[PDB]
Amino acid sequence: DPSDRLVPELDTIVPLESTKAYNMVDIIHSVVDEREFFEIMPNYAKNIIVGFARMNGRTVGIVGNQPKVASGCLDINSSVKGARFVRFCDAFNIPLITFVDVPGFLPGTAQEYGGIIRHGAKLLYAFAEATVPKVTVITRKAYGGAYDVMSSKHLCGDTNYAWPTAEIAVMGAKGAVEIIFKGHENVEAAQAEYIEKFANPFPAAVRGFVDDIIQPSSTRARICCDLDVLASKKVQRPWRKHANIPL
Amino acid sequence: YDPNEKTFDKILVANRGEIACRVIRTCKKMGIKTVAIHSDVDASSVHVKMADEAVCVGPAPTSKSYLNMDAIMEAIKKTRAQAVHPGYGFLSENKEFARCLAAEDVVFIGPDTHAIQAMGDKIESKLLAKKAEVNTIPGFDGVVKDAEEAVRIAREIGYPVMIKASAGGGGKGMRIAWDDEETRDGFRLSSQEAASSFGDDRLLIEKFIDNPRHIEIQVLGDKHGNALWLNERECSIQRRNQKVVEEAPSIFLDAETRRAMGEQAVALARAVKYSSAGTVEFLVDSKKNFYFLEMNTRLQVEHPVTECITGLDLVQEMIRVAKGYPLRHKQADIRINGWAVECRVYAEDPYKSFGLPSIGRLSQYQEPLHLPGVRVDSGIQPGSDISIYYDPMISKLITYGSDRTEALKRMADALDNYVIRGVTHNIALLREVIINSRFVKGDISTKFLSDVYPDGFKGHMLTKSEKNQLLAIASSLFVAFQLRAQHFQENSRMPVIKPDIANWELSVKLHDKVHTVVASNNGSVFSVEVDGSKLNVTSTWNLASPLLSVSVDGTQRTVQCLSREAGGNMSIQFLGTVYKVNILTRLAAELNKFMLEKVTEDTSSVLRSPMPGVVVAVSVKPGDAVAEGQEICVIEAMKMQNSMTAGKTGTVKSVHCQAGDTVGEGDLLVELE
Amino acid sequence: ATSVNERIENKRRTALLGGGQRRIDAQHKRGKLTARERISLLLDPGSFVESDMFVEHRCADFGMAADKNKFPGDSVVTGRGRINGRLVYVFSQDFTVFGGSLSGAHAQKICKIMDQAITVGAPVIGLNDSGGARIQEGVESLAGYADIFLRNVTASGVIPQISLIMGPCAAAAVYSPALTDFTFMVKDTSYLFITGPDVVKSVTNEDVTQEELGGAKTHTTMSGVAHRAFENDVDALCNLRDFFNYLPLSSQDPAPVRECH
Ligand SMILES: CCC(=O)SCCNC(=O)CCNC(=O)[C@H](O)C(C)(C)COP(=O)(O)OP(=O)(O)OC[C@H]1O[C@@H](n2cnc3c(N)ncnc32)[C@H](O)[C@@H]1OP(=O)(O)O
Ligand SMILES: Nc1ncnc2c1ncn2[C@@H]1O[C@H](COP(=O)(O)OP(=O)(O)OP(=O)(O)O)[C@@H](O)[C@H]1O
Ligand SMILES: *C(=O)CCCC[C@@H]1SC[C@@H]2NC(=O)N[C@@H]21
Ligand SMILES: [Mg+2]
């Protein structure tokens, strides 16, 4: 399987409007070698996807959001499921590839009473402490602290890419409009200018939060090359017996 | 192809898909700008990207996007398009469309309004053909209204009676009678269905031809009163009264009959004053007698297959005629340049009613363009989506050769080397038809699919030698995967001790039989013993490429490995058919003999939705005791309405499908006993 | 004659007053203290050394470059001090300025304090009172949070990290306390929830209030997020000093030993 194989079927997989959902497993199958994927916990906490695959013959760990289930929102079970897999992959020098499409965390009193804060912290910690090479591709939404959690560049991420359909923001364009222009009460054109200026990957691109805005048909060709140059990655961290993960 | 020829500067293609791409390509070859109209869904299709400029003309449904007169007219105004090419279907045969186009300043590339009006109705077309001294099918003139008139006509047209309603393209409004009892009861039923469909109640009664052959004469006419007949075509292979395989030169016909047919078609075209490209269809019997049957006043779907044997671009000639220039060729210039065969690759499941439309998205799509003598007309690409709104046709595959055998061999190779992953296609049926003995010999009719497969398409029935070849290929592929699994990189800390196994003893389960296979490897050559029979399989063994070419005992075979699991299951497309084989090691099978059989909850009593789309109506309710052959409900999608029969007798336990509700594929609709 | 001295004095007197005396009175009416007096209670008298006192935010969109939207300090007071003679680094979020929302300068000051603490090997104590992330800042605000998060993971197991929530905390502001070793709350004043009750009604259609959703009792009796809850700020800070007396300054130091009777 050539490492420069193109994937033109990913050019239009993401629907234009955010209401519809797609299957991240299709993207994963298209990108990886021979379209072979060993998925871990495929029937539990299905809003997140974790598994093992190969890129250019090298074992890689795949983490992604599933917009089919619960619109891809993170919750307790998905947080723990992703966190332990990420920790295992980091412990055994296995590179991580992340596909990000997440609107936020699942709201409700059940999540708050169950300790959603602790498990979201678990996932954020697992992504932050990893010293293996990690490559992140944003396919659409990345809102709020979830964007920080899903292996942002600011967590010592190596390479971050955004598809042309991506959008990184503090929160939704609407709610941002009614939270900024509260007293203006003339949001008819404010919404238009806000969506034309911020509802796109440019604010993250111009500040350097994403390395490049790539075409979806080159994703595999972009990833393998990175995994070729990050194989010798080596970082140094302060000494400790062990850290205190929010278990 | 003369750029100096001052033709229109901008042309609007008011269609979509393969015909839109073909028209755009022809216009680009002539240095003409194009305008592409599309719906919201088809915002990234092949034709919109191929053609400069694009106009969204409405939502996904065709009635509001491609049949929307106002949007198309506004697009023409905005783009200042001089001419419009309708292609086939949609507004190709609409008189009000022609009136709107001829209104302001823009020309319509096709027949004039008078010709379309004359050919629209079957009775007027038949009387015009009779005036044009063209052999017509035995039948009465006018509209039949009473059973006495129907039986009176049946007296002279014989017991075989073909009750056909006016209009209804695609096989609609057609019935068959065999007796006066059958005559009048069928005429009652035909009047009922004509009132239900359009209310015209105009029924045509004619003699039913036994074992007919559908022969189409392509005719090209200009505005200067010149008509040319470009050989013939054969479209006998049909299901649901729709053509799938077309053969350009009719092996059934000879020179004299072909000349007579062409002269009659030219005379009829002159009578109608046709000034474009069209086709005149005939039902040739076994005794080489041809009877007129309908005239299509548009570019035919299977027009490329004749092009290969004539070297003429029909779209280019149509555009030149629309400009006003006369025909550039004479009758003697038309000359047969070999043999050409065309197959329509559809997105349908051939195992269900010789084709059942299916939806999905193309994960992989590759055409055999590198193979010799292969031309592909496709309006799709990798990642394209098949939706219920449009025609599920995937592509048209055309092969040209010196003779019929070369063309058929090239077609078989192209079908074997054509990759579609994501949807279900009818390549198995096409390949099985191509290599059929009757088709190769030439004895075919309009009911070839029905009588060749009475129960239905079951797949290729592979022989003993082919079964051994398939088993050898599967075993070699399994062993190749096992060998590749052991090729790690050097560790320098814990060296890998590769096992030195010589013979692999395997149990291979195919269909229901279990075979014992002994496989050995000598580099690139696998020696496989299946039940004593010894074979040698050699190949590059590239396990990642979608297509794998192997040589079994010298014979070259192209196979595809669609699926593969660690449990031993493999799906292999071989000779165009997908076979499932379960491969285990001998010890694995011996231990598997102790495994308990899991309970399977399949005792019939349930009928899911075989086809996606919208259910028009539900004919059953809970507590209804249905019988065999009783249709549960009717579902419409992609201009086709299908009713699935229960196939068993049992009281309906519950009903989950309601009339007018969107129903996906595989959804459980009605439960019964 | 140079007006640099008068400008410096004016900037200092503005920094001490935070966002204005009226907002200080509003904060006091709620039973809450300001950041600077919280620091004064927490640390030993005459031992607080402030850092980045004149740092201001750099936003320019939505008319945030006006003089009325410029505050020295940017809703956080950061520095170092001593508890019972032992060094500690402290930051206190100022709810007076933009509701304590985190901006680029806020995150920069917190990150600088954490970097100094990890360089010298001293614990970090953080008093959290923040509405959330400044929407006017945009993605920058998010970036800042992530920076803090990264350090919260880098210092984990190296220096003790203590969080005391003394006001509302929502959105991405709830993850830094979750990454710290210990987390204390103040009754009837502090809150911790990712989404507010209004969004909960919008999505799941149920009636809950802020106290039920993210109150101190909720997180100390059924959620397992907070460790202890105190009645008010003064008692909370006294108990924080008492608790800090137990811990070592770094993981490279042995367990503290005190005079015994
Ligand atoms: C990780 C998951 C997510 O991303 S969830 C969506 C992201 N949410 C956010 O970014 C902010 C959420 N916080 C809020 O909406 C409110 O501040 C909350 C905490 C709900 C209300 O708290 P409350 O006790 O009523 O305080 P308050 O309304 O009296 O405070 C008013 C002053 O605070 C300010 N403030 C507050 N939040 C922001 C903000 N995000 N951006 C800018 N300013 C903010 C207000 O502007 C207001 O300013 P001022 O101090 O009166 O001058
Ligand atoms: N009189 C007849 N006798 C025997 N078979 C017939 C007769 N009329 C029609 N058929 C069969 O039905 C098929 C449909 O014929 P026809 O081209 O008239 O259909 P249609 O649906 O009107 O076509 P179109 O799509 O061109 O409008 C023929 O190809 C032939 O197989
Ligand atoms: C649905 O999108 C319309 C498909 C095109 C029309 C079809 S294709 C074959 C039939 N012949 C014809 O002239 N129109 C029908
Ligand atoms: Mg026809």
The DSSP output letter for A165 is: T
Return the number of CB contacts < 8 Å for A and C.
142
Residue whose C-alpha is closest to residue B177's, from B201, B147, B197: B147
What are the beta bridge partners of residue B515?
B508
Helices B255-272, B122-131: inter-axial angle, 10-degree rounding? 110
**Ligand 1 atom having least distance to the Cα of C98:** 50
B93 is catalytic: no
Q: Is B213 helix (H, G, I), strand (E, B) or coil?
A: strand
Which residues of chain B does A1 touch, with a Cβ-Cβ cutoff of 8 Å? 544
Q: Are strands B503-510 and B513-521 parallel, antiparallel or unpaired?
A: antiparallel
Which residues of chain C does A124 touch, with a Cβ-Cβ cutoff of 8 Å? 149, 153, 175, 179
Please indicate if any CB of chain A lies within 8 Å of the CB of C158: yes
**Residue the block writes with tokens 């074979």:** B535
Claim to verify: residue B73 and residue B60 sit in the same structural domain: yes
Claim to verify: residue B457 and residue B427 sit in the same structural domain: no
CB B390 within 8 A of CB B62: yes
**Residue the block writes with tokens 């004053």:** B273
Claim to verify: residue B42 and residue B69 sit in the same structural domain: yes
Please indicate if any CB of chain A lies within 8 Å of the CB of B382: yes
What are the beta bridge partners of residue A135?
A97, A159
Q: Is the CB of B407 under 6 A from ligand 2?
A: no
Total H helices, total E strands in chain B: 18, 38
Phi then psi for residue B336, to 5 deg, are -75, 125
- CA angle, residues B81, B87, B90, in degrees to nearest 5: 95
Claim to verify: residue B371 and residue B456 sit in the same structural domain: no
- Dmax (CA) for chain C in angstroms is 66
Closest CA of chain C from A56, distance in Å: 31
Choose one of B539, B564, B595: the last residue of a domain: B595
Neighbours of chain C (3+ CB pairs under 8 A): A
Please indicate if any CB of chain C lies within 8 Å of the CB of A176: yes
Q: Whose CA is nearest to atom 11 of ligand 3?
A: B89
Q: Is A75 helix (H, G, I), strand (E, B) or coil?
A: coil
Claim to verify: residue B193 and residue B301 sit in the same structural domain: no
CA gap B643, B610 in Å, rounded: 10
CA gap B22, B382 in Å, rounded: 18
CA gap A115, A118 in Å, rounded: 5
Phi then psi for residue B402, to 5 deg, are -65, -40
Which ligand ends up closest to the CA of B93? 3
Which residue among A1, A8, A26 sits closest to B544, beta carbon to beta carbon?
Answer: A1
Q: Whose CA is nearest to atom 14 of ligand 1?
A: C131
Which residue among B44, B363, B544 sits closest to A30, beta carbon to beta carbon?
Answer: B363
- Judge: A121–C175 Cβ closer than 8 Å, yes or no: yes
The DSSP output letter for B447 is: T
Q: Is B158 helix (H, G, I), strand (E, B) or coil?
A: coil
Please indicate if any CB of chain C lies within 8 Å of the CB of A204: yes
Choose one of B113, B136, B159: the last residue of a domain: B136
Quote the strand ranges of B187-334, DSSP E: 203-207, 213-221, 227-229, 233-239, 242-247, 277-284, 292-296
Claim to verify: residue B463 and residue B565 sit in the same structural domain: yes
**Residue the block writes with tokens 């105190």:** C230
Which residue ranges of B are tagged as binding site?
Answer: 122, 154-215, 241, 281, 294, 296, 354
- Judge: B382–A9 Cβ closer than 8 Å, yes or no: yes
Q: Is the CB of B170 under 6 A from ligand 2?
A: yes
Please indicate if any CB of chain A lies within 8 Å of the CB of C209: no
CB A124 within 8 A of CB C179: yes
Quote the strand ranges of B143-223, DSSP E: 161-165, 174-177, 203-207, 213-221
Closest CA of chain C from A71, distance in Å: 13
Number of structural domains (chain B) is 5
Token pair of B480, please? Answer: 């190749």
- CA angle, residues A24, A30, A33, in degrees to nearest 5: 125
Claim to verify: residue B246 and residue B317 sit in the same structural domain: yes
CA gap A95, B184 in Å, rounded: 77
CA gap B615, B599 in Å, rounded: 33
Structural domain of B535: 447-595
Q: Is the CB of B158 under 6 A from ligand 2?
A: no
Residue of C nearest to A171 (CA): C135
CB B364 within 8 A of CB B421: yes
Q: Is the CB of B457 under 6 A from ligand 3?
A: no
Claim to verify: residue B191 and residue B147 sit in the same structural domain: yes
For B354-364, give one letter per residue: b (16+ CB within 10 A) or e. bbbbbbbbbbb
**Ligand 2 atom having least distance to the Cα of B296:** 26
Instruction: Work out the burial of residue A79: count CB atoms within 10 Å of its CB; fewer than 13 is exposed, 13-18 middle, 19 or more buried.
Output: buried
Show Cβ contacts of residue A116 under 8 Å, excluding neighbours closer than 6 positions. A75, A76, A79, A105, A106, C194
Claim to verify: residue B591 and residue B601 sit in the same structural domain: no
**Ligand 3 geometric centre to CA of B638 (Å):** 9
- Judge: B382–A8 Cβ closer than 8 Å, yes or no: yes
Identify residue A151 by its one-letter amino acid code: S
Q: Is the CB of B15 under 6 A from ligand 3?
A: no
Claim to verify: residue B360 and residue B499 sit in the same structural domain: no
Please indicate if any CB of chain A lies within 8 Å of the CB of B364: yes
CA-to-CA dists, residue C106 to A149, C58, C89, C144, C174, angstroms: 20, 11, 16, 8, 16
Identify residue A164 by its one-letter amino acid code: P
Claim to verify: residue B343 and residue B219 sit in the same structural domain: yes
Q: Is C41 helix (H, G, I), strand (E, B) or coil?
A: helix
Which residue among A12, A29, A33 sits closest to B383, beta carbon to beta carbon?
Answer: A12
Choose one of B94, B114, B136: the last residue of a domain: B136
Please indicate if any CB of chain A lies within 8 Å of the CB of C185: no
Residue of A nearest to B484 (CA): A57
End-to-end CA gap in chain C? 64
Please indicate if any CB of chain A lies within 8 Å of the CB of C64: no
Q: Is B315 helix (H, G, I), strand (E, B) or coil?
A: helix
Q: Is the CB of B89 under 6 A from ligand 3?
A: yes
Closest CA of chain A from C75, distance in Å: 19
**Ligand 4 geometric centre to CA of B251 (Å):** 20
CA gap C58, C67 in Å, rounded: 12
Claim to verify: residue B240 and residue B358 sit in the same structural domain: yes
Which residues of chain B does A2 touch, with a Cβ-Cβ cutoff of 8 Å? 544
Question: What kind of experiment solved this structure?
Answer: cryo-EM
Residue whose C-alpha is closest to residue C89's, from C254, C240, C217, C249: C249
Token pair of B71, please? Answer: 């949007």
Q: Whose CA is nearest to atom 13 of ligand 2?
A: B241
